[PDB]
């Protein structure tokens, strides 16, 4: 027949066998789910706070919290766009509490980090060309951005095993509190945009949705919850300490830049297109306008400090050791090809090394358009990196710089954008540059873990199936919900009740503007708590 | 303290079995609808799962433009039924099978998603090969695949019949008027083969199980209501919209081919319009309708179409020639002097260089506001009775390049299902309101819970693990009249002077009913009531 | 608030609690990421040995091999193969004092990790590593130093701590055999490979998640060990002997380039799509294909047939018409077409495989400033096979014509590609050269197919886009159950798996015909892991 005779003869007895072809269908707990949406109470350092009260005899349990936000219509002049994943960037803090106190809470950045491997959650929060590309308003009544609604998935420990992990409401009042970051953090704009009026007129319009469960004869049992706690080290300090560590499931270490010493203005931004190449291309495109000029005699509208040299017959312009090959086609007979040899330059001493952005170009080819009176570039050979695109404009014109610094046109400088994204990691927009050369984790006096390479980040990325992980030390490899989590146990008598993190940062060149980008060390500790349901919901720190 | 061993486990001896990949040839029968029947009857085939239907696509020869719809294999399916002597065990509608497999990239790729299959190929001579023959594989996802051998269909001492109903070849093909579809429709035959993983089980211990059977109800044209009757034990309910193109000839201006992103659809449309939009001619252009308003671009480069300014600058234009702009390529209006929807007004800057060698304009950069809706407008709606203007002011050359698109699984009012046309959703169990929403939070939950980017407004009643538990369902009350699910939507009001306002809509409601699988004297299913 | 319809519907049978669970106290343990430096030994094959013996390491899993790639300085073109880290591996073996516990061939480890995007990215997949960089001066930096991470996926990772390798006071030795550096590098003739091969050293480090278990309760387990048999060159048969309890059997083909210098005209670099391979090839040919010259072009062999494009624009190469139109061509210059850039034939007046005939339209604009043609649009029929033809086959003895009629400039840009994990007869494994597959268990036919339905099932069941014709015998959940296997009958001679394929035949006038094939058959045998007086494995028979 259809089965091969070799198989039939091989089969056609005494040993006890587990049934792999049938199973006894277990009757589950009688329940009924419902998607419930609630309007909050807004309160106003005049920080916006949204409060959602959940109290209903029939809402036995809940999970999968989703916060929706109504983004308004943006009208006026100038350039405006929203940061990618705008919804997550709105969040400063989220708290879930009962009458007995806080059950679970997370910092805005930590919620975002936990959802970074979820493409759907990230897309829902606001990742579109409509939202993230930098739109321009021409008249005071021109529409820059159309109104839109974003959805932020507040991932909680109650979602891990669906109904099994759900937050039970033992006839108690659950309060979900959401603290919002200033609108400055979620917006990318130029000087021409009236941010002053926008900041006044903007209001966060939130709504909290969750999956509620009406359970008939619920059999509540105690559980365990991991609560994240972060410590931010002092500016440019390679150390941070998490105190009162008694039962931790994990410890994450990362770096964040600090732009308080700057006006938060950057030359370029790629918009919705967020790849490393997109950031580089947007920067190169912004510089090329002033870098290669086709003019009738020496170019005008540039500072006296600018050194604009006419390209010789051979096409090669020498900027010290660096040779720039510039060849433009269809150049009018009355005009010549010019190169800005010091577009952006930095130096600490009057005759030492100089970081010149024009030296980072080797070949520039294109064709001059008679119709539009502009140069259309064909191919650019350069060495521009993600760090260059991540340099705040202030650092080019800083007191440390002996040169003018910014030798661009006033037209180009007016196109600069303010970027206040609250969740930037490393020293660049893509968190590409690893500035941690060594990591040392001490549990008291004893060295708990040490590494010279980011193998803890490699393990984090593999074990969580994420492409954007952090240097994480995982202590729990036991299946969640069905088992009590494995934790690092303290010894208060021996002074082993704290985790001290020490990093060795990379040594950067003083004549490179990135040296002055201030760094902050972020250490995240996941503490183990026991969820008790005896006379309301309550949590107790495992010690 | 007593501790659970997390470092070692007792290796359980499983049921003695042997799997085999079995492929079968069907029986073809012919509204003259193609039906394939596969009979599975073998004493040694104890259980089966993972049904894969293969299709041998023929060589396409001749003249004109031709291409297959993306995921061609799934689009071929109209209906699939798995039945025994006692009747239907499980059945699904073609679109519902596709929806269940939309998150599976591998299944979608196997069904036919390649530049070879989906790009629009052109045949120059009557014997020129447009498309080479190919074999596509359609994964018929069934409830028997969920927990592999545990969920498998047991067919010990029973004849299982797998029936596949095929959609007309018109649905799976994108072609122009030049292509001889008449001959193709006659000459085309579906060549199917059904593969499945069969299990020869020694001393099988069969137990009863539960199965979710999908039921869809399609409402009438433009009716914002649909009702699913005799709902007694449902695990989920999905609501979506489908466009109806019966009032049209199913012809569209452009198609991107294999490249399926929203931008790909937009770029293909812009590219098709640019041929007539900016013209380099020796005096006023010819070959356009009298209704066309082709204006010469001034020295300034700016052409004003009412409130809209179009910047047109072309390089290397011959001294005897001028640059022209079609100011009303596609226009729509319900009244003489009302709001006019002009496609030429959706362009702000057009730059390029004229080629002396090829005697054509090579466009460099286009600044425009063209959307996914524009690319999804059937040509018929531009020239409809409701339009006071001519509508289609393109050249006869451009109109001849229009393609017929009859894809059976289109959702919403656009090719990417980007635009949400449902403003409100109301679901009623009997007469009482079961669920209501003003935002697509049920779609957001569906997309999150299923880890899908192409979800639907779904109400899930079952959050209990499948196979190992009896599914949680919405229970009926026949005495109280709660034995039906009524869906009512409020469609979002669009502008009357926009052609997409005239795309007819059909409401689709999908209900997953719970059934009990019994193996006492053959395989049989019983509706849970 | 809950809807009244739901409340009324709810407000004796034994029910399983789906809203709460008893949190079981697990085995007391403490994990640790442990990194170890090896011992390097060296015909003259690099071998790394890692010894694991510690009282505080009871169990281990998730082996990750780090490799320090050095700074590459000098002249010429250089780049690393995609997923460089995996390509470095020739063999990996985990053994105890009682012998080998588990081992895998380099290609098989890569195949098992092909469905893991993270593992592949970690091993080295970046424009920095995989794009072909050029060194201009003898001290110019071609490639900056980098660290790659190779995830050695083992059966101990399946169910985390449950599947982990237990070290019952025994010494575990992890041995990694490395492929020559030639295999992981794409370079031109200009690049001093001789010095590079001498100066290059594999710098490995083995990381693993170690577990310190208090009062471990060890129980025996089951392990699947992969075995592969490589058939005789071009032979459509291969046999795996002593098959007693196998969980699966995979069949695939590999090309063999021993009859060539392993040089190829083009390479896309980091961009690895079929189109990227094609575009890179077209771009490399266009330099010599369309020439703007003051009179007939020079610097080409006498064998080259370079025809001036007529006023019409169409050049006829027998049956094939090539439309060539270039803008801004100087008055003193003309447009030329190389009508036989690459040509092949086994007979003097028979069928010719001409690469120039594979082009229908070539448009562009001449640049006065750079004195070169900037191509705008190319209409062609170039395929993945064309890009996969070794240069040697164009100039082979079988070819009556010269073959390679390109310029010396173009020929100097050719790259050596020695990637050890190539499948099929093309770089993308696009062409399916197996027409039929027959698998025999002893003398009886176990399975046969005319279409790759076993590959389709493999791709679906493993959620992979790069699967192989695989026969799976085990559909039982791993670790918690003893795997289901094919059962041998030694008395009936049913103790071996014999694979016979029917290959489709290529055209003899197409250079690809001369690409050698190798049939690869992979068998996963079932073994029992015993911990009684050290770790040991026993073949299930």
Swiss-Prot record, chain B:
<dbReference type="GO" id="GO:0042802">
    <property type="term" value="F:identical protein binding"/>
</dbReference>
<dbReference type="InterPro" id="IPR005008">
    <property type="entry name" value="Poxvirus_Rif-R"/>
</dbReference>
<protein>
    <recommendedName>
        <fullName>Scaffold protein OPG125</fullName>
    </recommendedName>
</protein>
<keyword id="KW-0426">Late protein</keyword>
<comment type="similarity">
    <text>Belongs to the orthopoxvirus protein OPG125 family.</text>
</comment>
<comment type="subunit">
    <text>Homotrimer. Self-assembles to form a layer. Interacts with OPG158 (via N-terminus); this interaction is necessary for OPG125 association with membranes.</text>
</comment>
<keyword id="KW-0472">Membrane</keyword>
<dbReference type="Pfam" id="PF03340">
    <property type="entry name" value="Pox_Rif"/>
</dbReference>
<dbReference type="GO" id="GO:0016020">
    <property type="term" value="C:membrane"/>
</dbReference>
<dbReference type="GO" id="GO:0046677">
    <property type="term" value="P:response to antibiotic"/>
</dbReference>
<comment type="function">
    <text>Scaffold protein which forms a transitory spherical honeycomb lattice providing curvature and rigidity to the convex membrane of crescent and immature virions (IV). This association occurs concomitantly with viral membrane formation. Targeted by the drug rifampicin, which prevents the formation of this lattice, and hence virus morphogenesis. In the presence of rifampicin, irregularly shaped membranes that lack the honeycomb layer accumulate around areas of electron-dense viroplasm.</text>
</comment>
């Amino acid at each position: 027949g259809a089965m091969n005779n070799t198989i039939i003869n091989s089969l056609i007895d005494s040993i006890k066998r587990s049934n792999v072809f049938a199973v006894d269908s277990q009757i589950p707990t009688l329940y009924m789910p419902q998607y419930i949406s609630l309007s909050g109470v807004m309160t106003n350092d005049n920080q916006a706070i949204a409060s959602f009260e959940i109290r209903d005899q029939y809402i036995t349990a809940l999970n999968h919290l989703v916060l929706s936000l109504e983004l308004p219509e943006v009208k006026g002049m100038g350039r405006f766009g929203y940061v990618p994943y705008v919804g997550y960037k709105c969040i400063n803090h989220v708290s879930i509490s009962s009458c007995n106190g806080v059950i679970w809470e997370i910092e805005g950045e930590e919620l975002y980090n936990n959802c970074i491997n979820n493409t759907i959650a990230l897309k829902h929060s606001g990742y579109s060309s409509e939202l993230n590309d930098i739109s321009i308003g021409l008249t005071p009544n021109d529409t820059i951005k159309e109104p839109s609604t974003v959805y932020v998935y507040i991932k909680t420990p109650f979602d891990v095993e669906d109904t099994f992990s759900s937050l039970k409401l033992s006839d108690s009042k659950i309060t979900v509190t959401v603290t919002f970051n200033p609108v400055s953090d979620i917006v990318i704009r130029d000087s021409s945009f009236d941010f002053e009026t926008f900041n006044k007129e903007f209001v966060y319009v939130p709504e909290l949705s969750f999956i509620g469960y009406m359970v008939k004869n619920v059999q509540i049992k105690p559980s365990f919850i991991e609560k994240p706690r972060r410590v931010i080290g002092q500016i440019n300090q390679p150390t941070a300490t998490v105190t009162e560590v008694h039962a931790a499931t994990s410890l994450s270490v990362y770096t964040k830049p600090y732009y308080g010493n700057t006006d938060n203005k950057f030359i370029s931004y790629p918009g919705y297109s967020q790849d490393e190449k997109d950031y580089i291309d947007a920067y190169v495109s912004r510089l090329l306008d002033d870098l290669v000029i086709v003019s009738d005699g020496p170019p005008t509208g540039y500072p006296e400090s600018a050194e604009i040299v006419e390209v010789p017959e051979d096409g090669i312009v020498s900027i010290q050791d660096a040779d720039v090959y510039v060849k433009i086609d269809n150049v009018p007979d009355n005009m010549s090809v010019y190169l800005h040899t010091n577009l952006l330059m930095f130096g600490t001493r009057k005759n030492s090394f100089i970081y010149n952005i024009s030296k980072k170009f080797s070949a520039i080819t294109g064709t001059y358009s008679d119709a539009t009176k502009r140069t259309i570039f064909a191919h650019i050979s350069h060495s521009i990196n993600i760090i260059d695109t991540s340099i705040p404009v202030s650092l080019w014109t800083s007191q440390r710089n002996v040169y003018n610094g910014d030798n661009r046109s006033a037209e180009s400088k007016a196109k600069d954008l303010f970027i206040n994204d609250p969740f930037i990691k490393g020293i660049d927009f893509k968190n590409k540059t690893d500035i941690i050369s060594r990591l040392e984790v001490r549990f008291g006096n004893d060295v708990l873990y040490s590494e010279n390479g980011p193998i803890s980040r490699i393990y984090n990325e593999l074990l969580t199936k994420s492409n954007n992980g952090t240097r994480t030390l995982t202590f729990n490899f036991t299946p969640k919900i069905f088992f009590r989590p494995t934790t690092i146990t303290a010894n208060v008598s021996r002074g082993k009740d704290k985790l001290s993190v020490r990093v060795v940062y990379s040594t950067m060149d003083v004549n490179h503007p990135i040296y002055y980008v201030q760094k902050q060390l972020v250490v995240v500790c996941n503490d183990l708590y026991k969820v008790s349901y005896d006379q309301g919901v309550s949590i107790t720190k495992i010690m």
